[PDB]
Amino acid sequence: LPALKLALEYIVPCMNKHGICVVDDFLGKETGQQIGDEVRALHDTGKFTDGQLVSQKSDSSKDIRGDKITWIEGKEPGCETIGLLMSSMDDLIRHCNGKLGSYKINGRTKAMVACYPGNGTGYVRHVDNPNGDGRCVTCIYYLNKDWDAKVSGGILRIFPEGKAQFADIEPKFDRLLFFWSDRRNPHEVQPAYATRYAITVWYFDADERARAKVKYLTG
Amino acid sequence: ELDLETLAPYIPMDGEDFQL
Ligand SMILES: O=C(O)CNC(=O)C(=O)O
Ligand SMILES: [Fe+3]
């Protein structure tokens, strides 16, 4: 499937109708495995640190999210396949332009590479972008070979506003997920009992992200 | 109601944003 057809025939209608869109077998097993090695290498070489919160108050970040992460630009040596993933995500989003709600997506974060090190770690119910920080689309790539959610947990459960059913996303190998980052999609990472890896990029709406930067720079 | 930013995943809020 070309990006153009995936974007226009699937991602766009799916995002506009449901606000949550899964693409399985996104890059293929060979590229998926390479990404998984790069992530293992980061993990093994002690690159990960505690996942942080936008606004840190009295409780530890670890009470809220049990993952450890690093940020990847995609050009670092030994991270080139993550960079290919990021370009592939970018390509999809660029082919969606002007058709994802009324968003105009001009930019994104670096990739957040995140590991829940089993042990019942997860992420309490949250909204990625509750207060208008610019993030309009959350994009997650999973790379967990041999994941059995009934035994190892780690389900991403999303509660799409107004819907008769919540969405349970297993963190399955080579699975790509898009969802609106705002309050339409509260979500949680249910406790994980094996090592769970995912790479997240957030896409920014130009106008909202500009306002967010303004509020922050004069906050 | 809770400030939901206290639960939201951190992102760099200036000068780390990749332009597509
Ligand atoms: O890893 C997942 O499935 C979901 N992660 C998050 O919700 C997050 O980090 O904001
Ligand atoms: Fe989240």
Short mmCIF file of all heavy atoms in Angstrom, two decimals, chain A residues 52-55 71 90 94 106-108 110 123 130-131 133 135 204 209 213 216, chain B:
data_model
loop_
_atom_site.label_atom_id
_atom_site.label_comp_id
_atom_site.label_asym_id
_atom_site.label_seq_id
_atom_site.Cartn_x
_atom_site.Cartn_y
_atom_site.Cartn_z
N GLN A 52 8.59 11.68 32.20
CA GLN A 52 8.26 12.89 32.92
C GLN A 52 6.84 13.35 32.58
O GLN A 52 6.20 12.85 31.65
CB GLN A 52 9.29 13.97 32.62
CG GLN A 52 10.73 13.54 32.84
CD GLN A 52 11.11 13.64 34.30
OE1 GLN A 52 10.31 13.38 35.20
NE2 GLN A 52 12.35 14.05 34.54
N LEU A 53 6.36 14.32 33.35
CA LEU A 53 5.03 14.87 33.19
C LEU A 53 5.17 16.32 32.79
O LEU A 53 6.19 16.93 33.08
CB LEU A 53 4.26 14.74 34.49
CG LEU A 53 4.21 13.30 34.98
CD1 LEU A 53 3.75 13.24 36.41
CD2 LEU A 53 3.34 12.48 34.04
N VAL A 54 4.11 16.82 32.15
CA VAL A 54 4.09 18.19 31.68
C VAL A 54 4.18 19.11 32.89
O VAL A 54 4.94 20.08 32.89
CB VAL A 54 2.86 18.47 30.82
CG1 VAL A 54 2.68 19.96 30.55
CG2 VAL A 54 2.91 17.71 29.51
N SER A 55 3.36 18.81 33.89
CA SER A 55 3.34 19.59 35.11
C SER A 55 3.57 18.65 36.29
O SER A 55 2.74 17.82 36.63
CB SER A 55 2.07 20.35 35.25
OG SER A 55 1.99 20.87 36.56
N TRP A 71 14.70 10.22 24.03
CA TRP A 71 14.24 10.96 22.87
C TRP A 71 15.22 10.73 21.74
O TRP A 71 16.43 10.82 21.98
CB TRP A 71 14.17 12.45 23.21
CG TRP A 71 13.17 12.79 24.27
CD1 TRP A 71 13.40 12.99 25.59
CD2 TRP A 71 11.76 12.94 24.07
NE1 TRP A 71 12.22 13.27 26.23
CE2 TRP A 71 11.20 13.26 25.32
CE3 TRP A 71 10.92 12.86 22.95
CZ2 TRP A 71 9.84 13.48 25.48
CZ3 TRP A 71 9.57 13.09 23.11
CH2 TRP A 71 9.05 13.39 24.36
N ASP A 90 6.03 10.35 9.24
CA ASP A 90 5.99 11.69 8.66
C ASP A 90 5.36 11.67 7.26
O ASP A 90 4.51 12.51 6.95
CB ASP A 90 7.40 12.29 8.63
CG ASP A 90 8.02 12.59 9.99
OD1 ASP A 90 7.29 12.48 11.03
OD2 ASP A 90 9.24 12.92 10.01
N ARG A 94 2.05 13.62 6.14
CA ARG A 94 2.12 14.60 5.05
C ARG A 94 1.07 14.29 3.98
O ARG A 94 0.49 15.22 3.45
CB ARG A 94 3.53 14.67 4.46
CG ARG A 94 4.45 15.60 5.23
CD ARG A 94 5.79 15.86 4.56
NE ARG A 94 6.57 14.64 4.65
CZ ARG A 94 7.65 14.43 5.41
NH1 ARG A 94 8.19 15.38 6.14
NH2 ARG A 94 8.18 13.23 5.39
N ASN A 106 2.26 20.83 10.97
CA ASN A 106 3.47 21.37 10.40
C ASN A 106 4.72 20.77 11.03
O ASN A 106 5.82 21.05 10.58
CB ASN A 106 3.51 22.89 10.55
CG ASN A 106 3.60 23.31 11.99
OD1 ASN A 106 3.14 22.59 12.88
ND2 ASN A 106 4.21 24.46 12.24
N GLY A 107 4.58 20.02 12.12
CA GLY A 107 5.75 19.59 12.86
C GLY A 107 5.42 18.51 13.87
O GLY A 107 4.27 18.09 14.01
N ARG A 108 6.46 18.05 14.55
CA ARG A 108 6.27 16.99 15.52
C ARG A 108 7.37 17.06 16.56
O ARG A 108 8.35 17.81 16.45
CB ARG A 108 6.23 15.63 14.80
CG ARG A 108 7.51 15.29 14.06
CD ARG A 108 7.76 13.80 13.97
NE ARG A 108 8.83 13.45 13.05
CZ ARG A 108 10.12 13.62 13.26
NH1 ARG A 108 10.59 14.16 14.38
NH2 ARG A 108 10.96 13.24 12.32
N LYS A 110 10.45 14.97 18.61
CA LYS A 110 11.33 13.83 18.52
C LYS A 110 10.57 12.57 18.95
O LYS A 110 9.50 12.66 19.55
CB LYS A 110 12.52 14.02 19.47
CG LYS A 110 13.45 15.17 19.10
CD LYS A 110 14.53 15.39 20.13
CE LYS A 110 15.48 16.51 19.76
NZ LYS A 110 16.41 16.82 20.88
N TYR A 123 0.72 3.25 32.95
CA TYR A 123 0.45 4.67 32.88
C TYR A 123 -1.02 4.83 33.24
O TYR A 123 -1.88 4.28 32.54
CB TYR A 123 0.73 5.21 31.46
CG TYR A 123 1.00 6.69 31.35
CD1 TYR A 123 1.87 7.17 30.39
CD2 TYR A 123 0.41 7.61 32.20
CE1 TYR A 123 2.15 8.52 30.27
CE2 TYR A 123 0.69 8.96 32.09
CZ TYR A 123 1.54 9.42 31.12
OH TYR A 123 1.82 10.75 31.01
N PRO A 130 -4.20 17.78 27.26
CA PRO A 130 -5.46 18.23 27.86
C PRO A 130 -5.70 19.74 27.81
O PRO A 130 -6.86 20.16 27.85
CB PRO A 130 -5.36 17.74 29.30
CG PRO A 130 -3.86 17.76 29.58
CD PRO A 130 -3.18 17.44 28.26
N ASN A 131 -4.64 20.55 27.69
CA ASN A 131 -4.74 21.99 27.92
C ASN A 131 -4.25 22.78 26.71
O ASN A 131 -3.97 23.97 26.84
CB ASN A 131 -3.97 22.42 29.19
CG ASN A 131 -4.47 21.84 30.51
OD1 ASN A 131 -5.44 21.10 30.55
ND2 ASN A 131 -3.80 22.16 31.60
N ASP A 133 -1.51 22.12 24.20
CA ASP A 133 -0.06 22.29 24.07
C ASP A 133 0.39 22.14 22.62
O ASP A 133 1.58 22.21 22.32
CB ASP A 133 0.70 21.29 24.96
CG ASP A 133 0.39 19.82 24.70
OD1 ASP A 133 0.25 19.42 23.52
OD2 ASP A 133 0.29 19.06 25.67
N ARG A 135 -0.24 19.37 20.55
CA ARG A 135 -0.27 18.02 20.04
C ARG A 135 -1.67 17.66 19.55
O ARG A 135 -2.62 17.71 20.31
CB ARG A 135 0.12 17.06 21.15
CG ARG A 135 1.56 17.20 21.58
CD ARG A 135 1.83 16.18 22.64
NE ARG A 135 1.59 16.70 23.97
CZ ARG A 135 2.10 16.16 25.07
NH1 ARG A 135 2.78 15.02 24.99
NH2 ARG A 135 1.94 16.75 26.23
N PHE A 204 2.04 18.11 15.77
CA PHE A 204 1.57 19.42 16.19
C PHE A 204 0.69 20.06 15.12
O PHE A 204 1.08 20.10 13.95
CB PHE A 204 2.77 20.35 16.40
CG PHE A 204 3.65 19.97 17.57
CD1 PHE A 204 5.01 19.77 17.40
CD2 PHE A 204 3.11 19.82 18.83
CE1 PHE A 204 5.81 19.42 18.48
CE2 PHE A 204 3.91 19.48 19.91
CZ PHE A 204 5.25 19.29 19.73
N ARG A 209 -0.06 24.93 18.28
CA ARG A 209 1.29 24.82 18.82
C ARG A 209 1.89 26.22 18.93
O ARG A 209 2.66 26.48 19.84
CB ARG A 209 2.14 23.89 17.97
CG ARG A 209 3.57 23.72 18.46
CD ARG A 209 3.59 23.17 19.87
NE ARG A 209 4.94 22.81 20.29
CZ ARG A 209 5.28 22.40 21.52
NH1 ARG A 209 4.37 22.26 22.48
NH2 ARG A 209 6.54 22.11 21.79
N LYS A 213 3.26 27.75 22.48
CA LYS A 213 4.57 28.35 22.62
C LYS A 213 4.43 29.77 23.17
O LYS A 213 5.22 30.17 24.03
CB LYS A 213 5.32 28.30 21.28
CG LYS A 213 5.89 26.94 20.91
CD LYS A 213 6.71 27.01 19.65
CE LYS A 213 7.31 25.68 19.22
NZ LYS A 213 8.31 25.19 20.19
N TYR A 216 3.52 29.59 26.86
CA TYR A 216 4.67 29.09 27.60
C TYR A 216 5.77 30.15 27.70
O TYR A 216 6.36 30.33 28.77
CB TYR A 216 5.24 27.85 26.91
CG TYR A 216 6.58 27.42 27.43
CD1 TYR A 216 6.70 26.78 28.65
CD2 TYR A 216 7.73 27.65 26.70
CE1 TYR A 216 7.93 26.39 29.14
CE2 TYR A 216 8.98 27.26 27.16
CZ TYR A 216 9.07 26.63 28.39
OH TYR A 216 10.28 26.23 28.88
N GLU B 1 -11.92 20.05 39.70
CA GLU B 1 -11.37 18.99 38.81
C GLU B 1 -9.85 19.11 38.77
O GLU B 1 -9.29 20.18 38.98
CB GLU B 1 -11.96 19.07 37.40
CG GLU B 1 -11.39 18.03 36.44
CD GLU B 1 -12.15 17.77 35.15
OE1 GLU B 1 -12.79 18.71 34.63
OE2 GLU B 1 -12.09 16.62 34.65
N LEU B 2 -9.19 17.98 38.51
CA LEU B 2 -7.74 17.88 38.51
C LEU B 2 -7.17 18.64 37.31
O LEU B 2 -7.79 18.67 36.26
CB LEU B 2 -7.38 16.39 38.47
CG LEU B 2 -5.89 16.07 38.66
CD1 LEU B 2 -5.41 16.49 40.04
CD2 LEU B 2 -5.63 14.59 38.43
N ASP B 3 -5.99 19.25 37.50
CA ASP B 3 -5.16 19.69 36.39
C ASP B 3 -4.61 18.46 35.66
O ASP B 3 -3.70 17.78 36.14
CB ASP B 3 -4.04 20.64 36.86
CG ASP B 3 -3.20 21.20 35.72
OD1 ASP B 3 -3.46 20.84 34.54
OD2 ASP B 3 -2.28 22.00 36.00
N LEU B 4 -5.14 18.18 34.47
CA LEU B 4 -4.75 17.00 33.73
C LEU B 4 -3.33 17.14 33.18
O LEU B 4 -2.73 16.14 32.80
CB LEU B 4 -5.75 16.78 32.60
CG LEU B 4 -7.12 16.28 33.06
CD1 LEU B 4 -7.98 15.94 31.87
CD2 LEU B 4 -6.99 15.10 33.99
N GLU B 5 -2.76 18.35 33.18
CA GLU B 5 -1.37 18.46 32.78
C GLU B 5 -0.46 17.74 33.78
O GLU B 5 0.66 17.38 33.41
CB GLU B 5 -0.94 19.91 32.53
CG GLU B 5 -1.13 20.28 31.08
CD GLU B 5 -0.66 21.67 30.70
OE1 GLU B 5 -0.25 22.39 31.62
OE2 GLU B 5 -0.68 22.02 29.47
N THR B 6 -0.93 17.49 35.00
CA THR B 6 -0.10 16.80 35.97
C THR B 6 -0.02 15.30 35.65
O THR B 6 0.71 14.57 36.32
CB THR B 6 -0.56 17.09 37.41
OG1 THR B 6 -1.86 16.52 37.62
CG2 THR B 6 -0.57 18.57 37.71
N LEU B 7 -0.83 14.83 34.70
CA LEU B 7 -0.80 13.44 34.27
C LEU B 7 -0.28 13.28 32.83
O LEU B 7 -0.05 12.17 32.38
CB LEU B 7 -2.22 12.87 34.34
CG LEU B 7 -2.91 12.96 35.70
CD1 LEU B 7 -4.28 12.34 35.61
CD2 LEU B 7 -2.09 12.27 36.78
N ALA B 8 -0.11 14.38 32.11
CA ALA B 8 0.16 14.32 30.68
C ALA B 8 1.65 14.06 30.43
O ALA B 8 2.49 14.64 31.11
CB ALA B 8 -0.27 15.62 30.03
N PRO B 9 2.01 13.30 29.37
CA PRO B 9 3.41 13.01 29.07
C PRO B 9 4.18 14.26 28.66
O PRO B 9 3.75 15.02 27.79
CB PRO B 9 3.36 11.95 27.96
CG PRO B 9 2.00 12.15 27.30
CD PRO B 9 1.09 12.73 28.36
N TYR B 10 5.34 14.46 29.29
CA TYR B 10 6.18 15.61 29.02
C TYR B 10 6.61 15.70 27.55
O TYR B 10 7.04 14.71 26.96
CB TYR B 10 7.44 15.53 29.89
CG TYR B 10 8.52 16.50 29.51
CD1 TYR B 10 8.36 17.86 29.72
CD2 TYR B 10 9.70 16.07 28.94
CE1 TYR B 10 9.35 18.77 29.38
CE2 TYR B 10 10.70 16.96 28.60
CZ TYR B 10 10.52 18.32 28.81
OH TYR B 10 11.51 19.20 28.46
N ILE B 11 6.56 16.89 26.98
CA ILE B 11 7.31 17.18 25.76
C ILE B 11 8.09 18.48 25.94
O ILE B 11 7.58 19.41 26.58
CB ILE B 11 6.41 17.24 24.51
CG1 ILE B 11 5.26 18.23 24.66
CG2 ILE B 11 5.94 15.85 24.14
CD1 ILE B 11 4.60 18.64 23.35
N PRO B 12 9.29 18.59 25.34
CA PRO B 12 10.03 19.85 25.28
C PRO B 12 9.12 20.95 24.73
O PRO B 12 8.48 20.77 23.69
CB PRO B 12 11.18 19.58 24.31
CG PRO B 12 11.35 18.06 24.30
CD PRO B 12 10.00 17.49 24.66
N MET B 13 9.05 22.07 25.44
CA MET B 13 8.07 23.09 25.12
C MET B 13 8.71 24.27 24.39
O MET B 13 8.02 25.28 24.21
CB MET B 13 7.35 23.57 26.38
CG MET B 13 5.91 23.97 26.13
SD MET B 13 4.87 22.57 25.63
CE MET B 13 3.30 23.12 26.28
N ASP B 14 9.97 24.15 23.94
CA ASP B 14 10.55 25.12 23.02
C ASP B 14 11.86 24.61 22.39
O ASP B 14 12.72 24.07 23.08
CB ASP B 14 10.82 26.46 23.69
CG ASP B 14 11.95 26.43 24.70
OD1 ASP B 14 11.71 25.96 25.85
OD2 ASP B 14 13.08 26.85 24.33
N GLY B 15 11.99 24.81 21.07
CA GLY B 15 13.26 24.69 20.39
C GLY B 15 13.71 23.25 20.19
O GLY B 15 14.90 23.00 19.96
N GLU B 16 12.77 22.29 20.26
CA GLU B 16 13.06 20.90 19.93
C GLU B 16 12.06 20.37 18.89
O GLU B 16 12.05 19.16 18.64
CB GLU B 16 13.04 20.03 21.20
CG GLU B 16 14.41 19.81 21.85
CD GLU B 16 14.48 18.70 22.90
OE1 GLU B 16 14.02 17.56 22.62
OE2 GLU B 16 15.01 18.96 24.01
N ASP B 17 11.22 21.25 18.29
CA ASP B 17 10.14 20.79 17.43
C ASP B 17 10.63 20.62 15.99
O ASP B 17 11.00 21.60 15.36
CB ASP B 17 8.96 21.76 17.29
CG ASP B 17 8.04 21.92 18.49
OD1 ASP B 17 8.33 21.32 19.55
OD2 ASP B 17 7.04 22.68 18.35
N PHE B 18 10.49 19.39 15.46
CA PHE B 18 10.85 19.09 14.09
C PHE B 18 9.77 19.62 13.15
O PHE B 18 8.59 19.34 13.32
CB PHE B 18 11.04 17.58 13.96
CG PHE B 18 11.47 17.10 12.60
CD1 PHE B 18 12.82 16.94 12.30
CD2 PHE B 18 10.53 16.74 11.65
CE1 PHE B 18 13.21 16.45 11.06
CE2 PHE B 18 10.93 16.26 10.41
CZ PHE B 18 12.27 16.12 10.12
N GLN B 19 10.21 20.40 12.14
CA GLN B 19 9.33 20.93 11.11
C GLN B 19 9.22 19.91 9.98
O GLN B 19 10.24 19.42 9.49
CB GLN B 19 9.88 22.27 10.62
CG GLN B 19 10.03 23.31 11.72
CD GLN B 19 8.75 23.57 12.48
OE1 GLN B 19 7.79 24.11 11.94
NE2 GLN B 19 8.71 23.14 13.74
N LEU B 20 8.00 19.57 9.56
CA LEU B 20 7.81 18.54 8.56
C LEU B 20 7.97 19.12 7.15
O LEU B 20 8.04 18.31 6.20
CB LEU B 20 6.41 17.96 8.70
CG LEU B 20 6.20 17.07 9.92
CD1 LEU B 20 4.77 16.57 9.93
CD2 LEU B 20 7.20 15.92 9.90
#
